[PDB]
Every structure is written in structure tokens, then in C-alpha cells.
Symmetry: D2
Subunit: 184 residues, 4 copies
Amino acid sequence: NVPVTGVTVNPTTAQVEVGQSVQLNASVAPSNATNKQVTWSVSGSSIASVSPNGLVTGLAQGTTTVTATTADGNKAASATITVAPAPSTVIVIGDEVKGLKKIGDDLLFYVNGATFADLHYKVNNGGQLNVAMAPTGNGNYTYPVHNLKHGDTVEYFFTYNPGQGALDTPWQTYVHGVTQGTPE
Amino acid sequence: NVPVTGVTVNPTTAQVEVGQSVQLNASVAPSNATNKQVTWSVSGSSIASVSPNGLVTGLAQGTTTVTATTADGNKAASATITVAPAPSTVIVIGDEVKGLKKIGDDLLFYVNGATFADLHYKVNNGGQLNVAMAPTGNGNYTYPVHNLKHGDTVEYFFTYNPGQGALDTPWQTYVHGVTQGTPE
Amino acid sequence: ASNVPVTGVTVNPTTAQVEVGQSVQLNASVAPSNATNKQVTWSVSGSSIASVSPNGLVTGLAQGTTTVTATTADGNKAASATITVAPAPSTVIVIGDEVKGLKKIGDDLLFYVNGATFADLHYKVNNGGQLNVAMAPTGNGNYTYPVHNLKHGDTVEYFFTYNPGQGALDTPWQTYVHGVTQGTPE
Amino acid sequence: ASNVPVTGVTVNPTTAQVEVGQSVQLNASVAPSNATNKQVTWSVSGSSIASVSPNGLVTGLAQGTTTVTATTADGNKAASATITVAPAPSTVIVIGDEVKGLKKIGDDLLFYVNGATFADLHYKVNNGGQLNVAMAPTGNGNYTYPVHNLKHGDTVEYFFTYNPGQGALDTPWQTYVHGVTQGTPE
Ligand SMILES: [Cl-]
Ligand SMILES: [Cl-]
Ligand SMILES: [Cl-]
Ligand SMILES: [Cl-]
Ligand SMILES: [Cl-]
Ligand SMILES: [Cl-]
């Protein structure tokens, strides 16, 4: 009855963090077109995911292209999606003695004021890993865990002696880009 | 009383899959050295992790170097660790109608013999994603999920109509490099 | 004369595997065979993993599985192939002699110097800056230094400073090109 | 004369941040200041993330946090710095004119052609093969094609085939070098 003549996508560009969303909208012309259905597609599916109604979710750093195509006409229009890297900030999750710093997509585990310090940790459903943490050379220790992705669950505790004798901390859970703390 | 004169590490090279282990052993000379303590270290900690007693665990593809250093003497010897990629094989986890193929570190979700097919999935503690799966053009559908790491937990179910009407499958769990299936 | 409308398209082969930098040619078959307008657009859903030419040549870029689609200009009939990009076989390629050189191990190079009192590596990747490193003593007079996470077509200029006993010498500049330079399986 | 034994080492600065391809110079301070043997070995636990020179120049290689250690030849006294390698700021750099060129967006390039009926990109990265692509119609006469996951020092040779209306033309070959080629903030 009333054929589509064209389509547009708004917003025309967008920037999202990994795990963060943005809603795209197809405007079909004319307004009283009989069939206004669109199909949403993405050329860089590693970088961003698109829902059946144009919700775009950032997965990995990069720039990709998200298209609406009309069932009637196969008129196409596109937005450019930029998935940003993690802010280059330091988030402290712990106290004066022990804990971790979120440093983009790495964690820096620390123990301060110890005669020794080990770390026991499991990433998601992977294996338990055990490590002696590295002495900074002044009585404190660091150990980095590398290249965490959004929604990673890290379970960990420490064995250190702070002067009175060896102790285990309790099991703690960190979920990457969910668990919060204090900027450094 | 009896000083160390040297150290060796065996095996001298090793190859491991991601998530897979290998035990290194320091041999201190002479056999009746009074202090036989070693410290284990790794120069490529992204690629492989080393325990306080020389258990080396592959984390990511690459070649790194793992060293034993004697408390007495600081005599050092090294092994070369190669962390291999995933076998280039196809593991089917599903039936005739629906499921996934493990294809190295990607999953290929499939539905066969449907008038439409969507996928709903969550990776570890990340967000739910929803997607229309792509038509192969003969009545079947595929959708890849990209760049899974060892111990990743993927929870998923399908909405498809195979001819009688739309239905959801039950929630299923896949754990990357744990869940098994049949080679293609 | 009469406009003959397209009714279908199929793509062959319907699956393919390639390594990074390697190509596989897809062919869109439009139906019927006397259709006026035979044109197709090729697209890919995972462009980090694989690139498609306007004529359906698929090149592997990164490890993964993606989907390449041909769409008819007439009627927008679509058919798809699944493209898997494999990693490098689990083999070791020696590029050098029994004193110095490198091993290709998947996407990492192991540089080596046999029989010395020290060994240093001087190397630049593509148009990056020169890196200088002390190579790691194996503990037996031998040295090794890994260069990590090379891509196909990466150019590596290298040379060694090392002392086999008499005195310290610089080797000549050498060029390695990742997945082009050949050598002997170990 | 008398052998003066080393008693300690400290490293300064104790933390540093650098971008990929950028350097920071560490300095090992041996104690006491009249120690006979002042030599230190530098090592790093995360060599994919950062490289250390035999004289403690740290270069960023990949995003991450790692630990760089100085060890005294006399007594094996150790002190460490934490090195963070940052990603590229979240900015857009234009390399071209108002008709064609590319945008640097972090480690991806967005190639663009404004005002045409088709647009194709012809490009090679370092010593890889030539890729040919149809650029994606925005839907308004404009085209864009992303090149993904470039490293510092990557050399990109490109040119465009496109038709602004009169007829199809090839642009001249141009060279882009990732994190060396400059342009104007958008
Ligand atoms: Cl893309
Ligand atoms: Cl290493
Ligand atoms: Cl992709
Ligand atoms: Cl895909
Ligand atoms: Cl590393
Ligand atoms: Cl590290």
C-alpha cells in the first residue's frame, strides 16, 4: 500500500565502554509506510554486539559499523560505534595491609609490612593458581594478574606473616568492572 | 658448612596447553649442599605462571623462560616453556536441532530447521546479550561467540520456531576447556 | 527481450578453514542461470577475524570463526559460508645456524646464542624503535630471548652483540618477516 | 686498597606510567656510595607488557602492569618499580582532507570517502599481502571502513578507488605509520 523510500539511524556515531550499551533507532520514510520492519547487523561482532531491535553492547576495544536494513526496499543506513578502553585510573580495593588495585584491565595485588607473602586465586572456573608475591625490597609485596575481561570473577586470599606468624586471609571475590573501591 | 657450586632445571623445555601444568625440578650441586633452597621466577608472566615450588601453568599462547635461583650462591638455570594454542578440531555439544561447536577459542551456536532463531547468553558475570542468529539461507542458523578463555562460563538458551510455534530451550551451561562433546 | 528475475543464491564452499594471511575464494551461484542481474554484495559479521573482497575472496586476519554472506542486487537473496581462521601448527622452525639465529614457535620467536660469556639482542619491529636487551643465561654458556605476539607480515630487523671467548663481536643486521621467512623444522 | 661490599639497592622512580612505544629510564642506587662493585642486572616479570634494557630503560610493548627489578652483582640485593603501560587516550586524529583519508581511533583506523556512488579501499599492513574491500555505504553518499587492532610502528600503505560522479578514479598511494603519523584532533 505505502512503500518505504528510505531509512536513517540515530545517533549516527556513539562511544561506549566494554559492557556498556547504546540504543540505535531506525527512522523509516515515509512516516505512514505500511512495512517499517528493519534488520540490525554489525560488521565487527568481536568489538560490539547488536540485538534484534538495535541495542548495541561494547565487547572489546575498536570501532565497528552497525546497519539497519528495511524489510521493504532493503534501504540501509549505518552508525559508527567506538568501544573505548578502560579509564587509565587506579581503584584500590583493600586496606592499609592487603588488597588489589584495578589498573585498567590488570589487577595489582599488594601486601605491605610482611616477612613473606603468597597469593592464591582462581579466575572464573579455571584452576587455582599459587604464587609467591614479589618483594618490592622495603618489606612490601606486589603481584599483577594480567588481562582481565568485563565480568571476570577472581576469587583470592593471601598467606603472609606480618611479624606475629603466618595467617590466611578469608576468600574474597572480585568481579571485573562491577566491584568498586576508592581512587588512589 | 657445604656451599652450593651450581644448579640445573629439568625438564629443560616443556609444552603445555592453556590451563595445563608441568612440574620443574631444581637439582642443586653438590648433593650434600647445606642450603638447597631455590626461588622460582618467570620473565613472561602473561604466558605462564610459576608456583613457589616450580609448578608452571600455561595461561596464554607464547614461549617464556622459567628460572631457579639458589638462596646459596644465586646460581641460576632456566627451562623454556611453550604454551600451545587450542587443537584446531571441532567439538559438537548439542543434538540434531540445536547446540554449539567448540572451534578453538570460538563457539559456533547453531539451530537447524527453523523459521527464525535467537540466542540469549551471559559470559561469566557479564551482562545478558540477545541476538537474532544469522540465516545460512537453507532453513538453518549460526551465531559465533568470539575469543573465549579457559574457565569461561557461558550460560545460554535459544528462542526458535521449528514449525509448530516459538519455544525457549532450557538454560544450559558451557565452561570453556572443561565441557566436552563429540568431534565432528 | 524480458527481465529474468533472480529467485535464489547458494555459496560454495559452505565452510572453509584458512591460516592468518591465507585466502579462500567463495563463489555465489545465482538462480536461475539466465537471471538478467547476477550481482551480489559480500559482507562479513566478524571483520577482525576475516576480510572479504568485493568478489568474495576471504583472507584470514586473526584466529576465530565468522560468517561471510553473498546478497543478490535483485531480490536481496542471501546465502552464507562459515570461515574458521586457524592458529599456526604447533611446530618449531629454525632460522639460523648452530651458534645463533631464532626459532619461530607459533606467533613467538625464540632468539638464541650458543657458547658465550654474554649475549645481547638489538631488534626493531616494523617502524617501531630499536629495543636493546640482555639475553637470558640458560646457565650452561647458552642464551635465549623470546619476542612475543608477532602478526603475519611483521618485519623484524635484528643483530647480536656476544663474546664466544676471544672478544665481543657485533653480528650483521638480518631481516625476519613473520609467516614469509622460511627455515628448517627442528 | 680494600673491597667495599654492597649493603643495599633502591630503584627510582618506584612507579612509572608509559604508552606503548614510549620509554621511562629507571636508576638503581647502590649503597653504600663507595661500594667497589656497582653492577646491577635488570629483569622484568611481564615481558609481553614491557622490555628493559641492560641499563634499565623500560619501553612499553602492550597494555598492562608489570614489575622491573634491579639486582646487585655483589650480594644480590633487589629493589623493584611497578610499570603501567596505558592505552591511547580516547581521542580522534584526522589524517586527510574533507573528501578522503583516515581517522586514528585508539588502535583502529576509520578510513572514509565523502561524496560518491561507490568507494573501495586497497591497503597492505607491513609486509602482508594487499587486501581489497568495498567500503560500507553510510546511506547518505558517504563511506567508511575500519582497520582493526594496529600496533605501534605498523606501516599501512593505502589508496582509494571511488567515483564522485563524473567517473571512477584511483587516488595516489599513501603511507600511515601507527603512533608516528600525526594529524588534526576532530
Ligand atoms: Cl567492522
Ligand atoms: Cl619472557
Ligand atoms: Cl570482529
Ligand atoms: Cl561473526
Ligand atoms: Cl608477559
Ligand atoms: Cl608481571
